[PDB]
RNA sequence: AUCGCUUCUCGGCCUUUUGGCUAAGAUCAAGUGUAGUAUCUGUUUAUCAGUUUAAUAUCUGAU
């Protein structure tokens, strides 16, 4: 059995989080090494190119393929979606703003005026 | 313990949100007494007796 924790920090740069977020999603993915070895068979010492050595011009993908990319493509967007979690209508507390936007000035005064 | 779904709670974004300047750009506000106008609003009580009138009505009188 297996065991590991994740915790949130500060978004210190968009970087740090798109990087989160690429963990994620690459411990997510699993290889067909059946593919592989398929694909492998074929083309051999192309297989491994350097930045500038090998070259063959266009590798031309199964669209059932690219459905999956599609795919993720989505579930990613909607997950990126749900980015800021809002918090319930409460009219329970007294109203001073005359709008949202007056209410969220509001809010950020609350912030930084302590 | 792990995975997923749902429910509630909390944190983080919340710049995604206060058009620029000058001599704060400059200045300041009084009243319903009289009438009338206009608009809506309401209308064109029950007999009978008389007075009256071209006829109504009015007037008078109990309801």
Not at 24 to 45: C, V, W
Not at 51 to 67: A, F, K, M, R
């Amino acid at each position: 059995k297996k065991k590991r924790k994740n915790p949130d920090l500060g978004f210190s740069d968009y970087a740090a989080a798109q990087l989160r977020q690429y963990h994620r999603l690459t411990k997510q993915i699993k290889p067909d090494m059946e593919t592989y070895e398929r694909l492998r068979e074929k083309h051999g010492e192309e297989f491994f190119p350097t930045s500038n050595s090998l070259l063959h011009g266009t590798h031309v993908p199964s669209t059932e393929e690219i459905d999956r990319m599609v795919i993720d493509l989505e579930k990613q967007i909607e997950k990126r979606d749900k980015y800021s979690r809002r918090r319930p209508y409460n009219d329970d507390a007294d109203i001073d703003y005359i709008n949202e936007r007056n209410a969220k000035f509001n809010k950020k005064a609350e912030r930084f005026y302590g």
